Amino acid sequence: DTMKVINDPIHGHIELHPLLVRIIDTPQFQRLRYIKQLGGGYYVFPGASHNRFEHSLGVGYLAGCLVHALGEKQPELQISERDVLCVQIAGLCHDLGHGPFSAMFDGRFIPLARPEVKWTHEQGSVMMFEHLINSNGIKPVMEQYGLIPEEDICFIKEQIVGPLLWPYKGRPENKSFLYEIVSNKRNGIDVDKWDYFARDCHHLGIQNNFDYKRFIKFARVCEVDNELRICARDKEVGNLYDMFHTRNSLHRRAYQHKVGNIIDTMITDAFLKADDYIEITGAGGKKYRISTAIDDMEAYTKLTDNIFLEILYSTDPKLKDAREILKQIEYRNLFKYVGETQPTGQIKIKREDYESLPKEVASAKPKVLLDVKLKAEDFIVDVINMDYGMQEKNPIDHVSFYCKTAPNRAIRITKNQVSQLLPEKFAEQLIRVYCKKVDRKSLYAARQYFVQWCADRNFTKPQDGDVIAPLITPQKKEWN
Amino acid sequence: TMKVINDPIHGHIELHPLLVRIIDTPQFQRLRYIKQLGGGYYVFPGASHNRFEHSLGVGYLAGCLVHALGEKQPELQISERDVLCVQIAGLCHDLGHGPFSAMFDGRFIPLARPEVKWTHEQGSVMMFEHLINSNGIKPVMEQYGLIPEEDICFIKEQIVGPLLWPYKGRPENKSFLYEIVSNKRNGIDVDKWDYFARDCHHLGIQNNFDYKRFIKFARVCEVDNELRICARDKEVGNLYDMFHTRNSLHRRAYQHKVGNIIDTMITDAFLKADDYIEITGAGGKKYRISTAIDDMEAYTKLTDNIFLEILYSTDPKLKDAREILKQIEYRNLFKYVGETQPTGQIKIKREDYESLPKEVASAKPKVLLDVKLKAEDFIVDVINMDYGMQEKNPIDHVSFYCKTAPNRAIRITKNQVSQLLPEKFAEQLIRVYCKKVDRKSLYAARQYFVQWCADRNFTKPQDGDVIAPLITPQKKEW
Amino acid sequence: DTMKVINDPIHGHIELHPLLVRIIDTPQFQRLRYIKQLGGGYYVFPGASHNRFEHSLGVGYLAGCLVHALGEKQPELQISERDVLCVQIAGLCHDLGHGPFSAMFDGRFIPLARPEVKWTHEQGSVMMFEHLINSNGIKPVMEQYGLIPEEDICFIKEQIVGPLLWPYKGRPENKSFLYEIVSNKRNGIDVDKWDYFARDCHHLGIQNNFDYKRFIKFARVCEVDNELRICARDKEVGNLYDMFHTRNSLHRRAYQHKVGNIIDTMITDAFLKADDYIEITGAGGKKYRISTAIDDMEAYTKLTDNIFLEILYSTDPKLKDAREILKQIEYRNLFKYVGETQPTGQIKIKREDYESLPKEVASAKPKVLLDVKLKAEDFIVDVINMDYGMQEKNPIDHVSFYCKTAPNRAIRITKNQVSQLLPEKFAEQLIRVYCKKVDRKSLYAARQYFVQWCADRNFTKPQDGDVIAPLITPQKKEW
Amino acid sequence: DTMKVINDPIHGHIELHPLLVRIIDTPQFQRLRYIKQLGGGYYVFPGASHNRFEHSLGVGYLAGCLVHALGEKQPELQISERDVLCVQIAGLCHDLGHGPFSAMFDGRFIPLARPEVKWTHEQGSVMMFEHLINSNGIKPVMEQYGLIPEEDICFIKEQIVGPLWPYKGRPENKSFLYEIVSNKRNGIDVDKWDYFARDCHHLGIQNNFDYKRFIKFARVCEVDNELRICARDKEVGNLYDMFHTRNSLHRRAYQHKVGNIIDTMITDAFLKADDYIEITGAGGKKYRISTAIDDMEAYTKLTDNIFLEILYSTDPKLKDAREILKQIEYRNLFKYVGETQPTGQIKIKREDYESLPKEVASAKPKVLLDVKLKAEDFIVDVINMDYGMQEKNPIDHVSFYCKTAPNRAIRITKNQVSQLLPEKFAEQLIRVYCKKVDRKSLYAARQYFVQWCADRNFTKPQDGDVIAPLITPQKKEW
Ligand SMILES: Nc1ncnc2c1ncn2[C@H]1C[C@H](O)[C@@H](COP(=O)(O)NP(=O)(O)OP(=O)(O)O)O1
Ligand SMILES: Nc1ncnc2c1ncn2[C@H]1C[C@H](O)[C@@H](COP(=O)(O)NP(=O)(O)OP(=O)(O)O)O1
Ligand SMILES: Nc1ncnc2c1ncn2[C@H]1C[C@H](O)[C@@H](COP(=O)(O)NP(=O)(O)OP(=O)(O)O)O1
Ligand SMILES: Nc1ncnc2c1ncn2[C@H]1C[C@H](O)[C@@H](COP(=O)(O)NP(=O)(O)OP(=O)(O)O)O1
Ligand SMILES: [Fe+3]
Ligand SMILES: [Fe+3]
Ligand SMILES: [Fe+3]
Ligand SMILES: [Fe+3]
Ligand SMILES: [Mg+2]
Ligand SMILES: [Mg+2]
Ligand SMILES: [Mg+2]
Ligand SMILES: [Mg+2]
Ligand SMILES: [Mg+2]
Ligand SMILES: [Mg+2]
Ligand SMILES: [Mg+2]
Ligand SMILES: [Mg+2]
Ligand SMILES: [Mg+2]
């Protein structure tokens, strides 16, 4: 059991302490090799073959860089070797709970398959971590390196998911800044983002403009309303606004690419159709479904992107409907993108209303004669909440800064102290509509229903509206 | 025959022999001795690159864009002659830059000769004329199918704009050709694409705009009776990002507060040297640094080397200028005091710039001060940051097409894209510096500065509470 | 109907003609999304997650760049749009025959599982291409775009695998240069190498020093012994030696990494143990095994890296032995590397002798006290043939060059006309030894047998010889 | 008084201790901003605008990374903060002695201008460092941060230029510290790692050596009673590749035939200017270009600027020098005729270089020729290509360790690595050029050249059968 060096193309040669190597070399960690980081995005950006495994190594590594850098510059914080290891382990294990195709599984499939549960991959990560530890004899290995499992397991879990006065048990207040490394609940400025920006960009073929290494150099811990927090140099404020701008830009260009999303939707659909028939063996030989494997970590261990191919290659007549959806993916007979719009004014589309939207689009009465009627079943309506990670809030209002002439003194910097060219709002909704019927006449009709629906709901005019529905767009006074 | 040249940004590029003849002149080779980012090199040490290599890059990209349009749309009748003219314009577009590039036309000439309205682009047109005439290039143009009466004019118009349909070099059915090198309608041009990529490579800041993607999706469509370059509808987000990147490169690098003060110091040294340096132009006439812009033979010999000519001089008359450049090398720079912006609808007008150091020195901070500072001790640098068209959204001046009707041009408004985009497209930054560098002068300069910000109802400096703790409580709006 | 653009991180935005899009959007092509380019190398270099799919797009694209560039510079060659499409399709389809974990499948598994057949992934690519065309109605689509399927399918196949006097039917000798793009049988200078150099490096985190774009700019077709062939500028000769040096260096640093190879070996072992029990359905419902799916393209279509996980997640008691080997991979209880050596002198280890080598290692008699005796079954001996792509030959002796003052005149350039610092030989063998028993005492013993065996065979001294076997290495004066 | 961070595109954000900042902010250091790293190479590779200044920052930084990494992994070595600063200073100052156009100045000009002296830029760096320290009051600043100037100045100089135990600055138990900046035992030093990475970034050729990996695997072990830097055994292949890369960068870039002829032309102009240019040194004494190396105050003012000072001069005495530089700017370069190498055991010695143009002109090609050419018309450039230690394999002078005994040093021979490695480690290339550029002179120059190769039993030029079809059949060995 000695330290390993591993060559990562994003971070270079990184060092893994032998405790981390023991954690990595388990079935529960290695599972992340079989889950694509960007899910259906690989079917649009062919360089995006990367898996959660390598992202997880990167987050472990960066978490270690940030806590080491803080410890070197500020010995008064009393960051111990034990703290450093716990922060690295949390970085390493933070995404253990992702399911097949990553964001698809907790963003689309589980909410549709099991609308009663409130589940996130982060909860999965905590449960999977527990199962990793318990089934591989890791507690004695922790003790061998000076960790205290009652306290430190709890600390690690709290870093990943948040709390399970001062709500944490794993560390006291004098170590609060340690909870801001892996997953920053105050403002989202965390090393998870820095790894995925750099790694996704390298694979996508879109270039990263955020400099995380610069941020680490300028980061300090300062007292802010009587808690010790990570603060940035004042002159980095512009770079932080740019960080969130980059995040939003990566969601627009890649993560919410309209076809990447429809592939995720189709896979979700196939999983919903397969769910009654696929059996996954968990603890004590009990049988779980795709939707219930989240309840038993032994089952969930075996639930990866492989399930796609298990369905695609099946012959069972019961899986026929699921299998045909995946066949449609491989022949590229995808549901067709019709367009994009947004609400106007103070209108917000609520999650309770999502299910009713296909019916609304099909009920629009385009004032043009139509040969084809389309039914609700024929439309998909995907509502995407785009923000700066804190709903309507400006995350930079929850960051603290310091100045070169008083480096222990935290200050606030407001938006108006930076620039007038920044966003005026921090949240918005995009609505994408697609049609399951792909023939030319159905598609012409779907465009008319769509643009009419936008007019009826007082949504923004689709960008191509005048071209795809020339007879509809003149009817709307606010569009001309 | 063609030459190949290896550029680190674009790879191996081909130069037509007419371009090679233009490059191999004193007028073009001059660009090897003018830093792209001027004083920026004194802050970002990778930014050693010169205007020469930027110019090759713009020539190359100009050629890629016009070739791509011609291949996709043969009905436009883009000729080999048109391609060469566009390449030449890209190659020669920055011939007019002076020592330290933006410093020379942005700071020095306006101060040295406030009566003239000069730009490097005007310089590029005059330098091009002088390059052609003094190196026998007109017959070589003819040899390759160009018509110099028409094409020289076309080339110049591409660089500087017009010298109803205001252009003589090409008719309306070729208006798109004027949108490649320097796009007067919206600023979306290959010059930006080269400098984004090249500056980033050298600065150590990463480029996020994909120019190659833009070229693939570009088409020419009819818009209000002219053939113009349009982009695919779905690229609109990427164009907003393009201008966001431009603004971000100005914030991080080009307007870095110390890069600018170095540019200011060099400008100061040039103003102090201007009466004493003689540069010989055409017919043996004698020019100064500030007048060499009137004669391209003189201007040919004015490059960044003038910095070292002053620094190494022994002439007592250049003592004052020389001492400023010595201060740069010891890093005894004028000191940054801080940054602020106007509030509300307030605009600082160019006529008022000269009065601002006096205003800062006239502030009466209610604080005990060892030193009184005079107007001459402050520099107040006002920077106009925008999306290239003052208050306007340049995306309102772009045309788009949709996949289902690719010959039909459309407009896309800001509200059709995103609510997270900027609400304004122009703003002003105000940096204040002090020429007196000792600890007590600097403490005082901070008090005058923050008090001035309070008095003018400008934004609170980011470090205001720390540098002037007794001043910032006075102002209710902070 | 129309062209698609696709964004690749290595080549940027590439354009795909609609005929290529029809070929790509088939089960037979999309299969390549589930086959890792570097196989077991992903278990060593975590950035090497890339699959054969994206490599195939890249080779298609570069094949098109090279043939377009030749056509633009030399209209007299009469390169047609039809030729361009055929070269693109060949580049796109060249690796359709790879199996699970790529080089593992044709380099290790098939040779062990079916030693009677002479099979390569390239043969697989030809058969898979035939099956792709026939089962997706591609022939009429080819006709729609000006291709002539009798001739052009044959041309495409020949570009991939070679011939199936002038031995080719798809194109004549005045177009011989077209066979030098995707897979160059004369000297190995082909666009396949250029894509994988660039793509592997980007993912591995090792940097590429070969500039393929420069090579394309300087490439011309010239007459050489009555065939039209691709020639390089004279002054590029250095860069071509560097190309093969880079290839060799990527094999040393990554592709033949000792642990990447042992993982490939372990997976192969698990597949051999699973082979009797896994059923893959092929044409007419017939059942194939892992080792026989190469005989039926409908079965082979469904044979990808997924088989690893099918074994790993199985519960069938019959798959227990295969499953346990894959569990050993996941816990990193790997067969242990003992060391590396090479033959000396004139000695060449022949393929017929590979199987006898573990027995030789176990028969060595190290004069050292050992608690554990090891048997032949405990050693793995992996022999790797490292060369410049043409066994003992210098591939640069099979390249033609031209000079700036006579660009249509082909010439030869010998090694002595370039540099005295170049390699003296172009082939060698590396011998890696591993031990299947992983405890510290077995490993100590394995090192003594290994170093003694090297001494006995007069192989090169292992680099760490003095440290791992201090009592053995003094016996050998020449060490 | 506080640390500075600087953004370099090769190494990222690097930290500079305030003592380093004081050294950098002097005229003697800042001088390096005006000397191109690759000299005339910029006139072939237009991305290669980089100067010695940024290379020097990089070497300072890497020197610091290597010594820090050794200290972190091996606390028993007792590397102090003082040792780290001294190694950084040496890295930073190691190239202070370069002259105009870098390798051109000490490789071509000084040897020709002053054949009696044995001068290297490294000697210059030591003298320039001494002058930097003494004229900027640096010794008290060193003391303020824990350095001992009697000892540490000596240590710093020994690291730059070299020397029982021959060093005075540090004892044997710290010998490894002398292997960071300039490694005299085998050449594996951080100077190479910076220039590989930085040159590649600017040239547009990609670097394949991973220096960071080497740093991770580097350890100090006892070797024949000295503590030395050793590499992991399995890195041996990577080290052979390192020297292969060095050779490959010399072939592609640094010894590019046209880059060298430009260096030669500039050298020629400097030789013609040398009697007439005056550079003021200490106490107002006057130096020449060739003598400015004797006085650091003069040498401080000798940079690439001298090129433009000559080009723009009007003095009649500089006419010949000026005309050569004009020929560079119009691209009327001496023409490359070809390349060959000696055969067998033959080595061309430096004493014989001057006689070679005469030999080429004395060859008697049995061919009808329009022009007879004289010795003065040919340039013969002889280049020594090696792995940095003449005929020796530098890997024979490296020590390694194994994972199972990391404190135990071992040797690894070439046969333990690969049969595909080089069989020799040194060779000579001979390039011939002609000063007469017309077609008939050039035809003749090719005939003399190929005949000369045949007469001396040199290798057949690669294009020999094409440029001299009547000459190459005479030689049986071809
Ligand atoms: N020459 C090279 N260049 C770059 N990366 C390389 C490399 N060789 C390997 N890597 C990558 C592969 C891995 O990501 C990492 C480590 O590979 P090893 O350093 O080969 N270490 P291992 O555990 O095999 O040997 P041991 O136990 O004897 O120390 O570097
Ligand atoms: N091996 C190499 N690899 C990469 N870039 C290179 C290179 N060699 C040169 N460059 C860069 C340097 C230049 O930017 C460009 C062209 O250099 P040449 O191809 O050397 N052309 P020249 O005009 O000397 O030879 P001729 O007239 O005989 O064809 O490539
Ligand atoms: N903003 C962006 N920047 C870079 N690459 C991008 C990108 N957006 C997509 N890609 C990549 C993803 C793909 O690899 C490629 C094409 O994506 P689309 O241009 O979005 N084309 P699609 O076929 O969806 O829309 P249509 O049929 O309406 O033209 O570019
Ligand atoms: N946003 C940015 N991104 C990347 N590099 C940047 C940068 N801004 C500056 N640089 C580069 C330029 C330099 O190479 C380096 C340091 O520039 P500053 O951090 O601005 N430091 P200074 O001394 O001006 O301010 P103070 O004294 O208040 O700390 O970073
Ligand atoms: Fe994550
Ligand atoms: Fe420009
Ligand atoms: Fe391939
Ligand atoms: Fe150096
Ligand atoms: Mg997560
Ligand atoms: Mg998060
Ligand atoms: Mg301009
Ligand atoms: Mg412009
Ligand atoms: Mg502006
Ligand atoms: Mg293949
Ligand atoms: Mg091959
Ligand atoms: Mg040196
Ligand atoms: Mg050296």
Topology readout:
Four copies of one chain form a homotetramer.
Chain A: E1 4-8, E2 12-16, H1 18-24, H2 27-30, H3 52-73, H4 81-93, H5 103-113, H6 121-135, H7 138-144, H8 149-161, H9 191-204, H10 212-217, E3 220-224, E4 227-233, H11 237-255, H12 258-274, E5 280-281, E6 287-288, H13 297-300, H14 306-312, H15 320-330, E7 336-341, H16 357-363, E8 379-387, E9 401-403, E10 406-411, E11 427-435, H17 440-457, H18 465-468
Parallel strand pairs in A: 4-9
Antiparallel strand pairs in A: 1-2, 3-4, 5-6, 7-11, 8-11, 9-10
The complex binds the ligand Nc1ncnc2c1ncn2[C@H]1C[C@H](O)[C@@H](COP(=O)(O)NP(=O)(O)OP(=O)(O)O)O1 (4 copies), fe (iii) ion (FE) (4 copies) and magnesium ion (9 copies).
What does this molecule look like?
- The structure is a homotetramer.
- With 480 residues, chain A is of the alpha+beta class.
- Chain A folds into 2 domains: 4-260 and 404-417, Hypothetical protein af1432, CATH 1.10.3210; 336-385 and 429-479, Alpha-Beta Plaits, CATH 3.30.70.2760.
- Chain A is built from 18 helices and 11 strands.
- Chain A has helices spanning 18-24, 27-30, 52-73, 81-93, 103-113, 121-135, 138-144, 149-161, 191-204, 212-217, 237-255, 258-274, 297-300, 306-312, 320-330, 357-363, 440-457, 465-468, and strands at 4-8, 12-16, 220-224, 227-233, 280-281, 287-288, 336-341, 379-387, 401-403, 406-411, 427-435.
- In chain A, the strands form 4 sheets. In chain A, strands 3-4-9-10 form a 4-stranded mixed beta sheet, with no helix packed on it. In chain A, strands 7-11-8 form a 3-stranded antiparallel beta sheet.
- In chain A, a hairpin with a 5-residue loop joins strand 5 (280-281) and strand 6 (287-288).
- Chain A is globular.
- Chains in contact: A-B, A-C, A-D, B-C, B-D, C-D.
- The interface between A and B is large, with 47 and 48 residues.
- The PDB classes it as hydrolase.
- The entry lists the keywords triphosphohydrolase, metallo-enzyme, binuclear, HD, hydrolase.
- The assembly is tetrameric.
- The entry is titled "Crystal structure of tetrameric human H215A-SAMHD1 (residues 109-626) with GTP, dAMPNPP and Mg".
